[PDB]
């Protein structure tokens, strides 16, 4: 009766702050109960452990009010079977939501709206009795979002808080041998929803694993362990305190051993009873054992060295009563001296965010996943993460442990969406909420050696909570340091500077809370901690430009050690079309309202975990080697801190213009931060005209854990000489034919043939025997369909007059008409020769001009001149080029040229100079939300069908127009158009990405010369 | 002003000051007081408390209030009268001139604590010259050396009125009562009689 | 019905560190709510302050359980007049404990013995309904030990621990013009009563 939903349901627990949980055990590191030993300690499964996941019994309510009272006793006939772990939204119950900032609901704390998706979760399940006997049987929710009752066998349990975080219940008194029955009932919305404002999808349901563990009535309540080392390292100590529960008994002993493999390296033995801590004593039931280590092996995410720990309560007798263990791995984290040091060497994070979502599982997650992420991350470059924005699925740390990852936990605490941001921050009535969002990721994870760092959270402003739990943590666990970028990145909060989006060189000032170029932060008078920045170049779409200037300034600075990029994978989920056609997803795709659209699409990787170009910027700029060529030899860099090159070869190699003419291989010996001198073997003078360029390439002869054999881990180039070509063109045994209609010039010459237009001053078509070769005439073109970036917007509601777009748009940019000024035809003695001019205006303003000459030869070659005048007062434009629509369509593209994927000014340094041969489709780049792509700098020569372009441009090349792109919102709706469109750009602007939220496009990647000159020749085969 | 929170009782005696899963509780007895009180000049300092051992809920705590309310200094004797929670030394019943060299708790003569390697606050006994019964001998030790010391900036004598209560005899004649005079059990007896003046208030 | 002791007491708020209020007020500074400049200039003594302290209706018992519903609803017969404030050892009801360290009752937290001395008061006043219309009415318990549910006009209204701090309610929505009845049941032992042991007398 008291069980009562009628009862329970009343006090309106997901209303009130103060309660949090109820009848929720204690937090702790993860326990398995082991029984034996060598399973433990060889982490085999255990017995007492069991997963209730899979198929359970389902039901969605538009509101906890509408259950019915027998949902207690009985399974409805309405009910789904549904599997465990999941997100009900995933199962179409309804909609998930793609929100940032701005709550999804209304903005009144404590208080949900009356409306509150309720989901009843029920199972059926068998128990061993022995279970029942003796010891004790626990519950436990892994993740459950956001709040939620509970019930067992008809019997009220208790009821928590904390969508990241464990939930544990003893389930001793409710069981029954043989057939039970639990009842969950799942909210959407409550008071813990004010501390969950994270810039994601917002999902709900059991979407961590459900288990039962069987502890004896006597056990281990907890442990810790910690590390401790002489000056150099040559010898630590291992000092493990342990906790038990249940009654004291002097023949209780405890063990702790530890474990290299196989080999027993330490062990220890005693009795509970704890020093003198007080006045009153110590604690009776605890006890701490020493472990001394010699030349231990340490632990790095360079080489995750790891041992294993067992401890042991037993009898004194020998008889065991349980075990639990753990990984351990041996390593000092600390800050000094303004740096932070890791083994006593100082770091360079190599880091990303990254949250926990699957395109079609949603915030659900597994190992094979897990694994993933890991590998790509560590096969680019990367060697921390950082735990955007909640703590993670357990499996995680392990994984990372092993792996070898530097990570920040992070507290589960955002208020984004309160005004001001710090509204509950700086309320004591919101503490102890908060607190326990802290307290327990401690509790829980701090046994992890990846976890290096702690975070209080984020985007939730300033406020006194956070000054009392940083210290609470640093009192706890004073092994780590804790940061917190909320209210300003260098507060009394934190002990790191960690902004998020500063500058390298440029100060961005706002009001109570500026953010100084990085470089002058540091010198901010009295400043003497170190900065790493918690999220740095925003991935967003087509993004990425300026990375290196970071990894230049971090390279330059010590107390810059590195960044967090900003972010992973982007939060996409899968649709279908009519035709059961899956297709990627973003805010709004729902019917979810409110939503940022976009905006949730910000990875390195497309959510099935394809790489987005950017990535290689990224893996580039991070490479743990660095080069310097001088003369005939090469000086190589080694940024490891700890190991040795040991698996690493080098090839090198010679080219002209793409002929290879030498290569060579060797063996690397570098010692972490050390040098390596590369001799270089007489190399060749050829005599012909062309760019001979270096090429160097660091591979993995032998495959690792996370990578295969002949892994490319590093490379570099460079220019090594000029010959400029001197030569002439043979003369033509014949000189094109001019012909002059009223309505167009004509050039013949053989089975080939150009018009131009004489109206429009185009070449309007050109022919090749009887073929025509253009859908469209070749024309200037001043605008791209805008990037994420130019379009600029963090809210779908708040636009940026500021905006490139916005600003290119008001401009005319995209509308200016142009106007011949003049177009003449002259007949040379050994070709042909057009003038055109003109000029693009709107509304009386003339933006650009464009100055022409092409010029035909006997040798059927097409050379075009371009000179371009652009309005001081005008916007600059995205790109200066020209355009047009062949009528055919290949299969290859091949380049002369930065290569090979796609490259832009401000994000090229990763690409090569070489000689690229792709298919046509690779020359595309599925942005989910389409936009200018593809792009290809510095190229030289480009060949497509029987056509030939020569000169120093950028290009792309696909079947979508400039249009097409720009007017379509999800890459599933576009379809190729008719031929194959061609972009040849002269020049064209920086991507940025510092932030996509403003104007983020370096100055020295502007096209703001005024004044613009290029050549190109075009021919055929 | 202090914060309504002694667990002398628990053993060790930080037993739940150390415990996360009572940091809510005690923050609200915190909290509270400060919110209630932090207009009045005469509040000059705010305590965390007493005996309660030393815990990281202190820590935390202190830390609040320095962050709330920096216009005065807090103090806390717990663990030691010398811990990361307090800004002022502040033992109780430290000698003048004698070592008392518990472990882990030790209270050292004054004028010897002040000198301590790395030192630099100032000391004032939360508790001093315990004034039961006949009593209050050396007073004047502490005073000479309050007054040469400047690091000494005096101390609270314990304490001011004693706990008795009030009984009567059959021919309803009043008497002063403690300890397990209502069968009270179990109890310490005289021990709440520690004042400088009877329970009417009248003097020693 | 859910107002009912029966389901209140089921809860055992008193025997759980995580709840210490229910619908408690904010904390601040003292106020009156003057009306007048002057009279708040001058510490006059304000009309939106009124104080409940004099004869009140008691009645002891052993345990919060041994509470009879009606007293809900009806006085009982059996309730003395008191004055509040007050403490109830000092009237006979139980003994006041002078312990200084040992705490008074068996160390197992956040669990209280099962008996504990419940004392129910109640009282029952009147009410200007000018406050009825307009505004805001709060009562506020400057110290009650050591913890308590209460009930205005039958219905619960809230928890509160911790000794030595105000506790406020809004009455707002319970009260009724003209009579009006509070029922406070005020227990011995709480979990509250873990970070309370002063070396005091125990009331
Ligand atoms: C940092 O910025 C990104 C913007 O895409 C997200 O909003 C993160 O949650 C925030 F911390
Ligand atoms: C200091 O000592 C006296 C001893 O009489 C009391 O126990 C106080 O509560 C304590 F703080
Ligand atoms: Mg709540
Ligand atoms: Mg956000
Ligand atoms: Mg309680
Ligand atoms: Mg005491
Ligand atoms: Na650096
Ligand atoms: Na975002
Ligand atoms: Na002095
Ligand atoms: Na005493």
Same mark, same amino acid.
């Given at each position: 009766?008291?069980?009562?939903?009628?009862?329970?349901?009343?006090?309106?627990?997901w209303?009130?702050p103060?309660?949090?949980?109820?009848?929720?055990?204690?937090?702790?590191?993860?326990?398995?109960?082991?029984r034996?030993?060598?399973?433990?300690?060889t982490?085999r499964?255990?017995?007492?452990?069991?997963?209730?996941?899979?198929?359970?019994?389902?039901?969605?309510?538009?509101?906890?009010?509408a259950?019915?009272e027998?949902?207690?006793?009985?399974?409805?006939?309405?009910?789904?079977?549904?599997?465990?772990?999941?997100?009900?939204?995933?199962?179409?119950?309804?909609?998930?939501?793609?929100?940032?900032?701005?709550?999804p609901?209304?903005?009144?704390?404590?208080?949900?709206?009356?409306?509150?998706?309720?989901?009843?979760?029920?199972?059926?399940?068998?128990?061993?009795?022995?279970?029942?006997?003796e010891?004790?049987?626990?519950?436990?929710?892994?993740?459950?979002?956001?709040?939620?009752?509970?019930?067992?066998?008809?019997?009220?349990?208790?009821?928590?808080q904390?969508?990241?975080?464990?939930?544990?219940?003893?389930?001793?008194?409710?069981?029954?041998?043989?057939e039970?029955?639990?009842?969950?009932?799942?909210?959407?919305?409550?008071?813990?929803?004010?501390?969950?404002?994270?810039?994601?999808?917002?999902?709900?349901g059991?979407?961590?694993?459900?288990?039962?563990?069987?502890?004896?009535?006597?056990?281990?309540?907890?442990?810790?362990?910690?590390?401790?080392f002489?000056?150099?390292?040559?010898?630590?100590?291992?000092?493990?305190?342990?906790?038990?529960?249940?009654?004291?008994?002097?023949?209780?002993?405890?063990?702790?051993?530890?474990?290299?493999?196989?080999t027993?390296?330490?062990?220890?033995?005693?009795?509970?009873?704890?020093?003198?801590?007080?006045?009153?004593?110590?604690?009776?039931?605890?006890?701490?054992?020493?472990?001394?280590?010699?030349?231990?092996?340490?632990?790095?995410?360079?080489?995750?060295?790891?041992?294993?720990?067992?401890?042991?309560?037993?009898?004194?007798?020998?008889?065991?009563?349980?075990?639990?263990?753990?990984?351990?791995?041996?390593?000092e984290?600390?800050?000094?001296?303004?740096?932070?040091?890791?083994?006593?060497?100082?770091?360079?994070?190599?880091?990303?965010?990254?949250?926990?979502?699957?395109?079609?599982?949603?915030?659900?997650?597994?190992?094979?996943?897990?694994?993933?992420?890991?590998?790509?991350?560590?096969?680019?470059?990367?060697?921390?993460?950082?735990?955007?924005?909640?703590?993670?699925?357990?499996?995680?740390?392990?994984?990372?442990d092993?792996?070898?990852?530097?990570?920040?936990?992070?507290?589960?605490?955002?208020?984004?969406g309160?005004?001001?941001?710090?509204?509950?921050?700086?309320?004591?009535?919101?503490?102890?909420?908060?607190?326990?969002?802290?307290?327990?990721?401690?509790?829980?994870?701090?046994?992890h050696?990846?976890?290096?760092?702690?975070?209080?959270?984020?985007?939730?402003?300033?406020?006194?909570?956070?000054?009392?739990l940083?210290?609470?943590?640093?009192?706890?666990?004073?092994?780590?340091?804790?940061?917190?970028?909320?209210?300003?990145?260098?507060?009394t909060?934190?002990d790191?500077?960690?902004?998020?989006?500063?500058?390298?060189?440029?100060?961005?000032?706002?009001?109570?809370?500026?953010?100084?170029?990085?470089?002058?932060?540091?010198?901010?008078?009295?400043?003497?901690?170190?900065?790493?920045?918690?999220?740095?170049?925003?991935?967003?779409?087509?993004?990425?430009?300026?990375?290196?200037?970071?990894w230049?300034?971090?390279?330059?600075?010590?107390?810059?050690?590195?960044?967090?990029?900003?972010?992973?994978?982007?939060?996409?989920?899968?649709?279908?079309?009519?035709?059961?056609?899956?297709?990627?997803?973003?805010?709004?795709?729902?019917?979810?309202?409110?939503?940022?659209?976009?905006?949730?699409?910000?990875?390195?990787?497309?959510?099935?975990?394809?790489?987005?170009?950017?990535?290689?910027?990224?893996?580039?700029?991070?490479?743990?080697?660095?080069?310097?060529?001088?003369?005939?030899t090469?000086?190589?860099?080694?940024?490891?801190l700890?190991?040795?090159?040991?698996?690493?070869?080098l090839?090198?190699?010679?080219?002209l213009?793409?002929?290879?003419?030498?290569?060579?291989?060797?063996?690397?010996?570098?010692?972490?931060?050390?040098?390596?001198?590369?001799?270089?073997?007489?190399?060749?003078?050829?005599?012909?005209?062309?760019?001979?360029?270096?090429?160097?390439?660091?591979?993995?002869?032998?495959?690792?854990?996370?990578?295969?054999?002949?892994?490319?881990?590093?490379?570099?180039?460079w220019?090594?000489?000029?010959? +400029?070509?001197? @030569?002439?063109? %043979?003369?033509? #045994?014949?000189?094109?034919? $001019?012909?002059? =209609?009223?309505?167009?010039?004509? /050039?013949?010459?053989?089975?080939?043939?150009?018009?131009?237009?004489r109206?429009?001053?185009?070449?309007?078509?050109?022919?090749?025997?009887?073929?025509?070769?253009?859908?469209?005439?070749?024309?200037?073109?001043?605008?791209?369909?805008?990037?994420?970036?130019?379009?600029?917007?963090?809210?779908?509601?708040?636009?940026?007059?500021?905006?490139?777009?916005?600003?290119?748009?008001?401009?005319?940019?995209?509308?200016?008409?142009?106007?011949?000024?003049?177009?003449?035809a002259?007949?040379?003695?050994?070709?042909? +020769?057009?003038? @055109?001019?003109? %000029?693009?205006? #709107?509304?009386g303003?003339? $933006?650009?001009? =464009?100055?022409?000459?092409?010029? /035909?030869?006997?040798?059927?070659?097409?050379?075009?001149?371009?000179?371009?005048?652009?309005?001081?007062?005008?916007?600059?434009?995205?790109?200066?080029?020209?355009?047009?629509?062949?009528?055919?369509?290949?299969?290859?593209?091949?380049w002369?040229g930065?290569?090979?994927?796609?490259?832009?000014?401000?994000?090229?340094?990763?690409?090569?100079?070489?000689?690229?041969?792709?298919?046509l489709?690779?020359?595309?780049?599925?942005?989910?939300?389409?936009?200018?792509?593809?792009?290809?700098?510095?190229?030289?020569? +480009?060949?497509?069908?029987?056509?030939?372009?020569?000169?120093?441009?950028?290009?792309?090349?696909?079947?979508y127009?400039?249009?097409?792109?720009?007017?379509?919102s999800?890459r599933?709706?576009?379809?190729?158009?008719?031929?194959?469109?061609?972009?040849?750009?002269?020049f064209?602007?920086?991507?940025?990405?510092?932030?996509?939220?403003?104007?983020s496009?370096?100055?020295?990647?502007?096209?703001?010369?005024?004044?613009?000159?290029?050549?190109?020749?075009?021919?055929?085969?």
């Amino acid at each position: 009766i008291t069980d009562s939903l009628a009862v329970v349901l009343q006090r309106r627990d997901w209303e009130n702050p103060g309660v949090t949980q109820l009848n929720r055990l204690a937090a702790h590191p993860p326990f398995a109960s082991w029984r034996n030993s060598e399973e433990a300690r060889t982490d085999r499964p255990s017995q007492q452990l069991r997963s209730l996941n899979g198929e359970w019994r389902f039901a969605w309510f538009p509101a906890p009010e509408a259950v019915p009272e027998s949902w207690l006793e009985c399974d409805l006939p309405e009910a789904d079977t549904v599997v465990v772990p999941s997100n009900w939204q995933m199962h179409g119950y309804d909609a998930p939501i793609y929100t940032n900032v701005t709550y999804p609901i209304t903005v009144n704390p404590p208080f949900v709206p009356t409306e509150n998706p309720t989901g009843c979760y029920s199972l059926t399940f068998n128990v061993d009795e022995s279970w029942l006997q003796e010891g004790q049987t626990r519950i436990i929710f892994d993740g459950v979002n956001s709040a939620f009752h509970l019930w067992c066998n008809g019997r009220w349990v208790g009821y928590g808080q904390d969508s990241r975080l464990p939930s544990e219940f003893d389930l001793s008194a409710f069981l029954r041998a043989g057939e039970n029955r639990l009842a969950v009932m799942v909210l959407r919305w409550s008071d813990g929803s004010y501390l969950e404002d994270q810039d994601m999808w917002r999902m709900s349901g059991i979407f961590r694993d459900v288990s039962l563990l069987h502890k004896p009535t006597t056990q281990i309540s907890d442990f810790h362990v910690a590390t401790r080392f002489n000056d150099d390292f040559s010898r630590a100590v291992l000092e493990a305190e342990v906790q038990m529960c249940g009654e004291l008994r002097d023949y209780l002993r405890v063990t702790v051993s530890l474990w290299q493999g196989e080999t027993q390296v330490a062990s220890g033995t005693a009795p509970f009873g704890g020093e003198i801590i007080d006045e009153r004593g110590g604690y009776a039931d605890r006890v701490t054992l020493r472990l001394n280590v010699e030349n231990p092996k340490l632990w790095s995410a360079e080489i995750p060295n790891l041992y294993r720990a067992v401890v042991e309560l037993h009898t004194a007798d020998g008889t065991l009563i349980e075990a639990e263990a753990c990984d351990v791995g041996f390593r000092e984290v600390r800050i000094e001296n303004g740096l932070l040091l890791l083994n006593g060497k100082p770091l360079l994070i190599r880091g990303v965010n990254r949250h926990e979502h699957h395109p079609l599982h949603g915030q659900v997650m597994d190992e094979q996943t897990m694994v993933q992420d890991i590998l790509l991350m560590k096969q680019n470059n990367f060697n921390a993460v950082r735990c955007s924005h909640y703590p993670n699925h357990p499996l995680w740390y392990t994984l990372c442990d092993r792996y070898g990852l530097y990570v920040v936990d992070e507290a589960n605490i955002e208020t984004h969406g309160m005004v001001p941001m710090n509204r509950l921050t700086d309320d004591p009535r919101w503490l102890p909420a908060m607190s326990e969002r802290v307290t327990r990721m401690v509790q829980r994870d701090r046994n992890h050696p990846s976890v290096i760092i702690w975070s209080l959270g984020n985007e939730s402003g300033h406020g006194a909570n956070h000054d009392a739990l940083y210290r609470w943590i640093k009192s706890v666990d004073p092994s780590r340091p804790v940061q917190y970028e909320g209210g300003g990145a260098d507060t009394t909060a934190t002990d790191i500077i960690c902004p998020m989006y500063a500058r390298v060189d440029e100060d961005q000032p706002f009001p109570a809370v500026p953010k100084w170029s990085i470089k002058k932060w540091l010198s901010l008078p009295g400043e003497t901690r170190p900065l790493i920045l918690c999220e740095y170049a925003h991935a967003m779409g087509n993004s990425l430009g300026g990375f290196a200037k970071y990894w230049q300034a971090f390279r330059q600075y010590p107390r810059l050690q590195g960044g967090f990029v900003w972010d992973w994978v982007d939060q996409s989920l899968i649709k279908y079309d009519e035709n059961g056609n899956p297709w990627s997803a973003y805010g709004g795709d729902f019917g979810d309202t409110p939503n940022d659209r976009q905006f949730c699409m910000n990875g390195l990787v497309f959510a099935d975990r394809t790489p987005h170009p950017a990535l290689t910027e990224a893996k580039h700029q991070q490479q743990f080697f660095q080069f310097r060529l001088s003369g005939q030899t090469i000086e190589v860099t080694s940024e490891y801190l700890f190991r040795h090159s040991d698996n690493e070869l080098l090839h090198w190699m010679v080219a002209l213009d793409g002929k290879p003419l030498a290569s060579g291989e060797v063996p690397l010996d570098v010692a972490p931060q050390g040098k390596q001198l590369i001799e270089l073997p007489e190399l060749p003078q050829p005599e012909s005209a062309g760019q001979l360029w270096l090429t160097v390439r660091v591979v993995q002869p032998n495959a690792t854990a996370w990578s295969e054999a002949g892994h490319i881990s590093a490379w570099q180039q460079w220019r090594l000489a000029e010959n +400029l070509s001197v @030569t002439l063109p %043979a003369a033509s #045994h014949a000189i094109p034919h $001019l012909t002059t =209609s009223e309505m167009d010039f004509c /050039i013949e010459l053989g089975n080939k043939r150009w018009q131009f237009n004489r109206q429009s001053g185009f070449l309007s078509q050109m022919w090749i025997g009887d073929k025509k070769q253009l859908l469209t005439p070749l024309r200037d073109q001043f605008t791209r369909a805008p990037l994420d970036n130019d379009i600029g917007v963090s809210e779908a509601t708040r636009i940026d007059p500021n905006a490139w777009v916005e600003r290119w748009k008001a401009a005319g940019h995209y509308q200016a008409e142009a106007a011949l000024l003049q177009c003449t035809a002259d007949t040379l003695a050994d070709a042909v +020769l057009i003038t @055109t001019a003109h %000029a693009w205006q #709107h509304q009386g303003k003339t $933006l650009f001009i =464009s100055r022409k000459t092409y010029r /035909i030869d006997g040798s059927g070659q097409m050379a075009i001149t371009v000179d371009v005048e652009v309005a001081s007062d005008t916007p600059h434009p995205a790109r200066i080029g020209l355009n047009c629509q062949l009528a055919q369509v290949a299969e290859r593209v091949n380049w002369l040229g930065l290569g090979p994927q796609e490259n832009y000014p401000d994000r090229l340094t990763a690409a090569c100079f070489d000689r690229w041969d792709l298919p046509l489709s690779d020359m595309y780049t599925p942005y989910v939300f389409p936009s200018e792509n593809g792009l290809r700098c510095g190229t030289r020569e +480009l060949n497509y069908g029987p056509h030939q372009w020569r000169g120093d441009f950028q290009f792309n090349i696909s079947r979508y127009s400039q249009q097409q792109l720009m007017e379509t919102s999800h890459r599933h709706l576009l379809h190729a158009e008719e031929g194959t469109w061609l972009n040849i750009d002269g020049f064209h602007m920086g991507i940025g990405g510092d932030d996509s939220w403003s104007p983020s496009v370096s100055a020295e990647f502007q096209l703001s010369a005024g004044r613009y000159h290029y050549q190109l020749v075009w021919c055929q085969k």
